[PDB]
Scaffold this active site. Structure first.
Site, short mmCIF file in Angstrom:
data_model
loop_
_atom_site.label_atom_id
_atom_site.label_comp_id
_atom_site.label_asym_id
_atom_site.label_seq_id
_atom_site.Cartn_x
_atom_site.Cartn_y
_atom_site.Cartn_z
N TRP A 49 -5.34 -4.23 1.54
CA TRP A 49 -4.68 -5.40 2.10
C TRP A 49 -4.99 -5.51 3.60
CZ3 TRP A 49 0.78 -5.62 4.41
CH2 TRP A 49 1.28 -6.91 4.39
N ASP A 84 2.83 1.80 -0.95
CA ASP A 84 3.06 0.37 -0.74
C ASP A 84 3.20 -0.20 -2.14
OD1 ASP A 84 3.08 -2.32 -0.20
OD2 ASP A 84 1.41 -2.28 1.24
N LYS A 126 7.00 -10.88 -4.76
CA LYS A 126 6.14 -11.34 -5.83
C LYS A 126 6.86 -11.20 -7.18
CE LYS A 126 2.82 -10.46 -2.37
NZ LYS A 126 2.89 -9.33 -1.43
#
Lengths: 398, 403
Positions: free
Chosen positions: A130, A212, A248
């Site tokens: 990311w 993460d 999300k």
């Protein structure tokens, strides 16, 4: 020297690549597919507030709650329920509410400068990862940002031998940022067996693990199944630091609901760590926003809403799979050169398509807004734009 | 060395003094006055969700909105309306760069970081009032400021501004220093500069080429009028100062828990606004990506909708007036009990707080008798009821006489 002259000298910074491209995609005229940010859209291509979230908003309003400050750490019932979704006792862990996953990665990165020398200790990101990991960790004061081999584009698979090599070559006591599942951008995760090997390496080398966890649910369609890595590392005795997002999997992107948690055996040290977390929060934003946390808490804790949420997330993951299949079948029909099985074998919200920079630029210039690195939000597709994507890829490749 | 052994070495920090005393106060049993945090309470001492906010929650729900990410800078309609309340519908609105922040604290932190890109934060002094909001120091330190200084401000002997000392310190600072000024409703003292003092402070900031950073957390509470309370920021703008301003809606809209704020700069050079914005966004993105939408959406609705707006201003004015009635109640009782000394500061101080003037030991006393003011003598007057105002005036009278 006047203040105007001082301001005159401020150094501009480049736009965020992803947010800027999303803006372009949103502004574009004509038939198009905005496939930049990993946000779920429904069957008709519409933004999608979850049905369970709609219910929760009414239930909350009916409670006539106040707007008084949360504690610095945040809303405890939310923290407690959120940690349970990842680990499946709360006395073994210390946790606070954060400004979503990004805020967790930032606060964790900062916290870690109190236990490692961030001037010299390497902090490792996946190749690729990311993009905001770099900027967040650098802002938190990490001077030595490194990468571990992860993805091999030629085989659309993990370069696991390379990853192990890099973990072992790192000096003892380095920090590793690992994606807990649904690796972004690649959509390729370690297998369960590979995770076991990774845990043993992290233990053997005395590395700090920082997970993460932004897409729990989207790798397999099951929250439990997708928590395999964090739970294994916990079983192994690893002092897991973990950044969690509800952007999300609950679709609370705008409400910024997340946690940062650390697994640590010693009760006194947990209190000391919590006091550092709180000091870091207080000096940045005082305390976190309540609305996202309150919505999430009610969904996680209410028996009916919790079951409804899991089924909704499963259905969302299924819709992504139908989109992968629609794209893949069309690439096969058009006989697009190359292999395209990664479209259906990658998991999470994206495909990482393997097109060249020029080919991705071509797609963007024909209103198919994938990133320059070849990442496409499969969850942003409809049947019709799934065909358009395949057709544009076909043109770009030829 | 194992990771377990490395975590062992982490050093504990003290708990936040104000949030900690607030926790004790809320936990205490018996007749008590919890006057620690600066949060508004109603006539019965209850948390007070504003009627206009309740109306705005329903209107938002009826709009069936999505939860897609806001832009990094935040929700533009909120930002535009928010900066309008501070500067008015004026030319300054085209000359400014602004982002949504995590309330006022977020704006102070973000502003303090932004300023490290324009000034040398290793060297350049950044000035806080003597005394100030306890969190200013930590926020500014954490943003990278190595030379934090104070300006003379409150004089406990006169319960008033030491204005000569303030001017002296502004002048004694090297040219091009940063000054954090409370826009109105000084925290913790409730003593503001007069309009005349503000004009003199503007002249000195211009002469010395200082950067002004306004902390504007209580617009509305100094007077009950948004227009009146904006005088300082509007005067500085009018006189050509590149005002940086941190705005909160926690108090004036009661949106404490939703963290709605802005950071704004007025810039001489209309063409460098894009460059400044790019820095602000870079700082935001590397911290939390983008801000929470719910508070901004509520506030936007209340600011932009004609009926809500008028109703909010009425409601805020009524809140300010209730605070005044509490100050008058305390003060009339201090007069009646012939408490030694003068007590006019109680009614002359403005905003949420009174800095009462009691010693450390006297404040500790009050605390142990369930009158929870701070150890520095700060009292949230907006936390009072008729009943607890009398109890405060009485416990002050006991503390002065007996401690």
């Amino acid at each position: 020297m006047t203040t105007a002259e001082r301001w005159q000298k401020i150094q501009a910074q480049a736009p965020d690549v992803i947010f800027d491209l999303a803006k372009r995609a949103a502004a574009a005229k004509g038939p198009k597919a905005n496939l930049v940010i990993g946000a779920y859209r429904d069957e008709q291509g519409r933004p999608y507030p979850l049905r369970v979230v709609r219910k929760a908003e009414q239930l909350l309003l009916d409670m006539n709650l106040d707007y008084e400050y949360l504690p610095i750490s945040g809303y405890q019932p939310f923290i407690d329920e959120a940690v349970k979704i990842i680990y499946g006792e709360l006395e073994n862990l210390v946790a606070v509410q954060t400004l979503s996953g990004t805020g967790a990665v930032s606060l964790g990165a900062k916290l870690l400068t109190r236990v490692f020398d961030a001037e010299t200790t390497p902090i490792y990101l996946s190749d690729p990862t990311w993009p905001n990991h770099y900027g967040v960790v650098k802002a938190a004061g990490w001077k030595n940002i490194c990468t571990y081999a992860y993805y091999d584009p030629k085989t659309v698979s993990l370069n696991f031998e390379g990853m192990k090599k890099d973990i072992l070559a790192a000096p003892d006591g380095s920090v590793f940022i690992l994606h807990q599942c649904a690796h972004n951008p690649t959509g390729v995760d370690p297998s369960q067996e590979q995770w076991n090997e990774i845990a043993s390496l992290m233990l053997a080398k005395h590395h700090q693990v920082f997970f993460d966890s932004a897409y729990q649910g989207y790798a397999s369609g099951s929250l439990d199944t997708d928590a395999y890595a964090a739970r294994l590392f916990a079983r192994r005795g690893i002092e897991v630091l973990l950044a969690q997002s509800f952007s999300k999997n609950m679709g609370l992107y705008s409400e910024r609901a997340g946690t940062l948690s650390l697994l640590l055996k010693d009760k006194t040290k947990r209190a000391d760590v919590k006091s550092v977390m709180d000091s870091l929060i207080r000096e940045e934003y005082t305390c976190p926003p309540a609305h996202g946390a309150r919505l999430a808490h009610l969904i996680l804790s209410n028996n009916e809403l919790r079951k409804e949420w899991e089924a909704e997330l499963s259905a969302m993951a299924e819709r992504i799979r139908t989109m992968r299949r629609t794209v893949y079948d069309e690439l096969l029909r058009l006989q697009t050169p190359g292999s395209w099985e990664h479209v259906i074998n990658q998991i999470g919200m994206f495909s990482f398509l393997g097109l060249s920079k020029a080919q991705c630029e071509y797609c963007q210039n024909h209103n198919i807004f994938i990133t320059v690195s070849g990442r496409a939000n499969m969850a942003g597709l409809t049947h019709e734009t799934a065909l358009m994507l395949a057709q544009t890829i076909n043109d770009a490749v030829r």
